[PDB]
Amino acid sequence: MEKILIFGHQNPDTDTICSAIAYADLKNKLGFNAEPVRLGQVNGETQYALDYFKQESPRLVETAANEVNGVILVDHNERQQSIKDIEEVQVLEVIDHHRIANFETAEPLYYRAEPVGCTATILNKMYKENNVKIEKEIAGLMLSAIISDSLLFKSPTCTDQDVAAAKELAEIAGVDAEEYGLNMLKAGADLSKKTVEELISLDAKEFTLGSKKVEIAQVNTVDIEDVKKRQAELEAVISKVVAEKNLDLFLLVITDILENDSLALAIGNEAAKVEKAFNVTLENNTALLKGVVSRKKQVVPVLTDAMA
Amino acid sequence: EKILIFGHQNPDTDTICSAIAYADLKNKLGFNAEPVRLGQVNGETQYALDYFKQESPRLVETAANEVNGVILVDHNERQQSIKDIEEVQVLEVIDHHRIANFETAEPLYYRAEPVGCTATILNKMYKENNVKIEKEIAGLMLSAIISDSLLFKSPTCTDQDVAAAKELAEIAGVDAEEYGLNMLKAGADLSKKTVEELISLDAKEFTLGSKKVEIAQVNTVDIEDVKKRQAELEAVISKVVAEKNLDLFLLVITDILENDSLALAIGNEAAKVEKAFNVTLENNTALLKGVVSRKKQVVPVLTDAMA
């Protein structure tokens, strides 16, 4: 039975890891042959989820074509967010909830995107459509992904489907969603053991907006001040990436998970487009983005219009 | 609140019927939708529309002057879509083709399934939503399945297409084989058709790698009747190739009974058809044995051959 790899994006975050694992489990329980893999380091928020439900980290890979002919993408589609040799394998399926860009197939495929809060909310539907029982631990991972991408049901991308799925999965997982969730989020906001290199890359995503190359990284915190004090070190690693990747903008979004506001740190030739996008004034490369917690909904589209 | 729902340019039966069917589904769910079309309906689709007593959807050229949001069925690629697609928001796509030349600013509902046509997906969507399919909508969806499967002979026809067709034929009240042959043959009537109509009635544009292509298909019960108009076909095709800067125009002349196609290839990359199908072009043509499906049996091998 032909082997496939399932993976999320570069710089893996909780949905990318947990949805890879969940979808491979769904494929395997249906008699197929799938391995969840990951494309980079597991962050602390995902580590808490993996440790709590006693699941191993997916195997790390840099390429797929040496292993398989066919892959499934979860939690992304854009080539530059994907495995470095994506053009050498066939994308059989994509399960996702982001905008579509920089993605092309030679052939028809199963492409399933729904504008909900995360991939795990779609996978929950798919288990039910396929009459496959969700194990306790898988449900905990899928619940973990929903909490992560909704910031405990606070993000404006959180839909009623996400809430309903979290309720089902918390019950299957045997945990109280708010208690577990707070602890998971706090574990990823523990920025004490983290270098600035880790801070700008743990949850970083590349995009092309119009003709401009951008990178938007996100970090969660309970105190924006404790990130802000590392600004000079942050601008040093950021401007190094800006040069290396020829970016027009690197935007770091430092998210206060208590207040649901973010401090932006914008470096690059197009930094002023951030002022236009958010109606905000950059002072010493930063500005408070009030209520802004979601990259796909509150950053990407307004930045696209601004840079156009 | 008002949205338009349409298929691709040069409408074929799935593109007309699934726009109508999905609009029906949305309206029954209390939303505000109208099915539209982007060009002329062919004879096959007209048969379907006549048989189930449905009018042709309204013809539009643009959308941003009426609505802000649209739903695409049966396609995604910008160049197959409405001329001002970049002016509107694509809310949803329901499709069964390769994805290319398609980008959104925002998350959306994108549902592609590698089945025989869009109507097979929409059949599943009526059930998911618990909405009855009216008799005539069912006949239009059956039409779409028969059209794209060539009466269940195409290798793109899946078990899901077969099962949907059996449910829809029973709701519509027709014998699928009897009605299907007649619908197919109505589209295979090439007599009163000009060559301009032959190369455009079911023509789709693609970019394959860097190469600009157009691949058009016509159904026939005698390949030799359309082959007798080769000189005339070569003049209208040559004109399109120059006007649109095509590297390749490929006319696929499909024998709907024998499941074979005659290729007619014009343009700088005409020799890639030889490589793609392991055939030899004789006077710009070659018989493509068993080749019936553009999305599954033409576009991918051509893409490889042209890379």
UniProtKB/Swiss-Prot annotation, chain A:
InterPro entries: DDH_dom, DHH_sf, DHHA2, DHHA2_dom_sf, Mn-dep_inorganic_PyrPase
SMART domains registered for this protein in UniProt: DHHA2
Binding residue positions for Mn(2+) 2: 15, 75, 97, 149
Key words, A-Z: Cytoplasm, Hydrolase, Manganese, Metal-binding
Protein origin, superkingdom: Bacteria
Catalytically driven reaction(s): diphosphate + H2O = 2 phosphate + H(+)
Name of the protein this chain belongs to: Manganese-dependent inorganic pyrophosphatase
